[PDB]
């Protein structure tokens, strides 16, 4: 139940706001809905019914069809369309992860411990952090547009 | 509405009524010493000042907004003394609000953070309790957060016009840069090699700072004092009403009491 | 709320609190004046006095002696003219505008009259 | 920034395939609950009417 | 009436609850500035 | 409930409400209407008490309702001006103190010898421009054990009940409370003290005090809290949650208008979710040192969405 | 002062005395405000808050609706802490400090604790 972490999952578009006070809204209409509503069939009270009813065996039938089955506003499982629509968002945002953030990791552990260190070795080595520090800097600047 | 209940009312009254009459002389012996303050005032502002009217010192354009200046005092019980402060630098800054406000004083800091708190720059409390003097303008003109590098300056303040009313007046104040480029500057024989042009500016944000300040408390105490005069003939007409209902329901008292013990009696 | 709905009686609480603050806050304003109150209490007084005014509509019957025709506001009318003076909307017009009118369109008109 | 949007969208797509069922099981309990009790009150105010 | 010895305080109408008011204002903030100054010099 | 010098409407109206609420099957509704005579209306108090301390005699409790005393000392001093007797102050009988004072203190709890069993009272007084220091307003103060004042201010505005906390107070203290209403509550009746002589400072002009800032904020959202609507009694386990976040500055935060919204939306979550928390309040009726950790915690992460 | 000593004489005089002038000062107060009080009459009305705060006790009786415990001040306490806070050895503490407390001793310990 991830309430501080569910507002701000999104990136820096704002886009997603509008989806993402649709989707809160539903599920709490919903669980209010089953709790304020009796979670059991119906009383029924077929002994105080049919004696006192004016016509013969009157209340004695409609109780027996009330109590076998009846229709419903329901649906089955056929339509999955957010079950389908979860494995394409995962192949294309989460699975973007794995080599855009994997390679940023990589990149800025070993600019990091070459720039930090004797003369000519080291030059050597800072020359490769430098490419990669300018490279960093303009996917600094595309990631913001 | 009973014997408790009216006593208490009109005992109430009858001290507010004393005391409102006896701040109102206490406001006219106070307006006596205020005159010749600000008699002494407008003769200085006459004198020191002659300088700009001869060579006729006027602003232009803007240069990063402006400056303004409330001037007015921390307490209350003035009638419209604050009221009429805050209307007349609220129609000034419809044309300009990126102008910052420099408040000295609690009520018209407190009226001007309820429509333009972001404008705000300034606030000074602590000067409408005493008499003002060339100690507190001097030390006020010093410390305004870079007062020179503004185009516009001006110091709202109430003028008392007569001896009963008043109304808001508005002085502006030119910096060291509109000071020499007026028309006739060079007609007087001034030393360009010392302070001349930053000089006439500084001295004369101090003297009309002063000649503001004790226009501004001449004009609330002459308007406490007509405050006062109304609260105690507003007070008078009521106990006068509180004592006719008080007369009634006493001689009301005396006959429901006298009807119960005849009543008792008899049966 | 369950008979009139949720709707007139918020307007109904309204227009009661702003009433009861000004009647209480009568010594000071009779004895000192209306210049000692606040910022919060100046904006209460003079929506309060509005108020008063509009709910006094002329009567059929009695357009003798005042000389007015007759106002029958209904009940889905009074209650949209008291919530939009209380939220800020008619603050500008005067309190004579309000005096023995009917809803939201007598005031409007009388407002509009009186200042040509 | 980048790592924490792999696991936020990993669980807002799995969020959205539960929130779709769960609607879907609170409208088919709701109808069932007020089917249910249009019956049981129309059957006590014919019986009380009678009585 | 006589005996005019606090009743505006023993009315407890408009002037009675603002005196009571701003007696209890000046009371708090008096003691927001004692409790300061005895806690940075307490030794 | 004992309706006497009611209307034959306003009986009618009262006891159709309960039975639809399942609420008319275990209380004793005494008919005593002002169209009947005036040896009815002023027995009507001595009839009712006698069939409520029945309940109290055997181990049971009784809860009497003398709607209202003002009605019923107006019955009584018709029948004894009509006998040929002589009246006392405000045309009444001579023991008008004594008729309301021997009623009222047969409603006691008794001890464990005696079953164990209690009668609670509860007598309406209807004031005339709440005006208290009357001759029936007086004697009825003065003989039970605390008052519930109403006054007529707060109740146009829309604070439903208007009960005063620097008037209405109660002779049995906290002992007559909860141990979980105690705790999350314990100040309470400070808190209203303190906040009534904030909210008049506000229409003087002075808007400094920073530290008066979260008493003033506070108090506002207490109030409006613990205003509920007509036929919504709340539990002890539902008033236990509302209390704590109100006092400890949770609801600080939170909006003024938004204060009705949030007292439903807590006791929903707290019913499907962590429901060990409500169900532990209402059988122990206290809270220890994990049932304080675990309601501050829960409180916390509620507020924001 | 023949019965009680000429000490404990003087020291109901002064605190009545200061209780009295503090109902006229008050008057002026909620009219004018604290702009009109001198220096006199700033101290007098800091010293008739504390002194009136001071003589309320908590009892014992009294402990379920109080909550603190209670204290019991003897005759010889009393009168000397009532005759150093009018000197002026007790005014740079609290009024809170004196609220609900026994003698000298209970009003020297509530100020500290009350800074912590």
Not at chain 1, 24 to 40: G, T
Request: charged residues 25%; hydrophobic residues 40%.
């Amino acid at each position: 139940l991830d309430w501080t972490k569910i507002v701000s999952k999104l990136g820096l578009s704002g886009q997603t706001a509008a989806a993402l006070t649709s989707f809160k809204k539903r599920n709490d209409e919903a669980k209010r809905i089953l709790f304020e509503l009796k979670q059991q069939p119906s009383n029924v009270d077929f002994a105080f019914y049919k004696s006192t009813l004016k016509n013969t065996a009157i209340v004695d039938k409609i109780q027996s069809d009330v109590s076998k089955f009846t229709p419903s506003k329901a649906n089955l499982s056929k339509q999955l369309n957010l079950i389908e629509s979860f494995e394409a968002k995962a192949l294309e945002n989460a699975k973007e992860t794995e080599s855009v953030v994997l390679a940023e990791l990589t990149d800025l552990e070993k600019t990091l411990e070459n720039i930090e260190s004797x003369x000519x070795x080291x030059x050597x080595x800072x020359x490769x952090x430098x490419x990669x520090x300018x490279x960093x800097x303009x996917x600094x600047x595309x990631x913001x547009x | 509405a009973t014997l408790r209940e009216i006593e208490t009312r009109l005992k109430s009254i009858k001290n507010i009524e004393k005391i409102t009459n006896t701040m109102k002389v206490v406001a006219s012996t106070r307006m006596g010493r205020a005159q010749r303050a600000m008699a002494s005032s407008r003769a200085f502002r006459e004198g020191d000042s002659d300088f700009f009217a001869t060579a006729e010192t006027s602003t232009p354009e803007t240069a990063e907004k402006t400056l303004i200046i409330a001037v007015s005092s921390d307490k209350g019980l003035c009638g419209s003394i604050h009221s009429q402060i805050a209307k007349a630098t609220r129609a000034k800054l419809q044309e300009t609000p990126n102008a910052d406000v420099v408040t000295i004083g609690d009520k018209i800091k407190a009226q001007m953070l309820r429509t333009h708190s972001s404008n705000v720059v300034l606030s000074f409390n602590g000067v409408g309790k005493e008499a003002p003097t060339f100690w507190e303008a001097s030390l006020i003109a010093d410390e305004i957060r870079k007062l020179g590098d503004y185009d516009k300056i001006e110091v709202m303040y109430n003028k008392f016009v007569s001896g009963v009313a008043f109304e808001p007046s508005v002085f502006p104040s030119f910096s060291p840069i509109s000071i020499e480029e007026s028309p006739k500057l060079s007609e007087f024989e001034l030393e360009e090699d010392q302070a001349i042009p930053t000089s006439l500016s500084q001295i004369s944000l101090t003297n009309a700072i002063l000649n503001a300040m004790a226009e501004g408390y001449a004009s609330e105490i002459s308007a406490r004092r007509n405050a006062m005069d109304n609260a105690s003939k507003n007070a008078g007409e009521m106990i006068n009403k509180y004592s006719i209902l008080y007369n009634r329901t006493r001689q009301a008292v005396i006959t429901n009491e006298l009807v119960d013990i005849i009543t008792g009696a008899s049966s | 709320v369950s008979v009139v709905g949720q709707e007139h009686y918020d307007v109904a609480t309204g227009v009661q609190q702003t009433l009861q603050a000004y009647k209480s806050l009568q010594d000071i304003i009779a004895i000192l004046g209306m210049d000692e109150l606040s910022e919060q209490d100046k904006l209460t007084v003079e929506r309060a006095r509005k108020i008063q005014r509009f709910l006094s509509q002329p009567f059929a019957v009695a357009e003798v002696f005042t000389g007015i025709e007759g106002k029958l506001v209904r009940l889905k009318d009074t209650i949209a003219s008291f919530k939009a003076v209380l939220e800020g909307k008619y603050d500008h017009l005067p309190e004579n505008a309000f005096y023995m009118v009917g809803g939201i369109e007598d005031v409007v008109a009388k407002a509009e009259k009186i200042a040509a | 920034d980048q790592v924490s949007n792999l696991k936020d969208v990993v669980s807002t797509t799995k969020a959205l395939f539960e929130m779709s069922k769960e609607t879907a099981a609170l409208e088919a309990e709701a109808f069932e609950l007020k089917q249910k009790v249009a019956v049981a009150s129309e059957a006590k105010s014919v019986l009380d009417s009678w009585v | 009436v006589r005996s005019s010895a606090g009743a505006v305080r023993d009315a407890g109408g408009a002037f009675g609850k603002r005196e009571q008011a701003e007696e209890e204002r000046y009371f708090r903030a008096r003691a927001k500035e004692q409790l300061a100054a005895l806690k940075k010099h307490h030794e | 409930y004992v309706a006497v010098g009611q209307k034959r409407s306003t009986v009618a109206q009262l006891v159709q409400t309960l039975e639809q609420n399942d609420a008319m099957k275990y209380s004793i509704v005494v008919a005593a209407t002002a169209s009947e005579a005036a040896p009815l209306q002023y027995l009507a108090p001595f009839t009712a008490c006698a069939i409520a301390e029945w309940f109290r005699d055997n181990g049971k409790h009784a809860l009497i309702v003398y709607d209202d005393l003002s009605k019923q000392a107006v019955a009584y001093r018709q029948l004894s001006l009509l006998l040929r007797r002589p009246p006392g102050r405000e045309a009444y009988p001579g023991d008008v103190f004594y008729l309301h004072s021997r009623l009222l203190e047969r409603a006691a709890k008794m001890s464990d010898a005696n079953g164990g069993g209690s009668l609670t009272a509860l007598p309406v007084i209807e004031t005339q421009g709440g005006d208290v220091s009357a001759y029936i307003p007086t004697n009825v103060i003065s003989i039970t054990d605390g008052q519930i004042f109403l006054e007529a201010e707060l109740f146009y505005k829309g604070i439903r009940p208007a009960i005063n906390v620097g008037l209405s107070v109660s002779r049995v203290g906290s002992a007559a409370q909860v141990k979980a209403m105690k705790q999350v509550a314990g100040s309470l009746k400070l808190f209203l003290a303190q906040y009534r002589e904030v909210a008049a400072f506000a229409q003087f002009g002075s808007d400094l005090d920073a530290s008066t800032k979260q008493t003033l904020s506070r108090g506002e959202r207490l109030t409006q809290l613990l205003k509920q609507k007509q036929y919504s009694p709340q539990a002890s386990e539902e008033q236990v949650p509302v209390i704590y976040a109100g006092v400890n500055g949770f609801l600080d935060n939170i909006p003024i208008e938004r204060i009705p919204e949030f007292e439903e939306q807590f006791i929903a979550y707290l019913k499907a979710n962590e429901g060990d928390i409500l169900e532990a309040i209402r059988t122990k009726g206290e809270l220890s040192s994990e049932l304080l950790d675990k309601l501050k915690s829960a409180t916390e992460t509620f507020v924001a969405t």
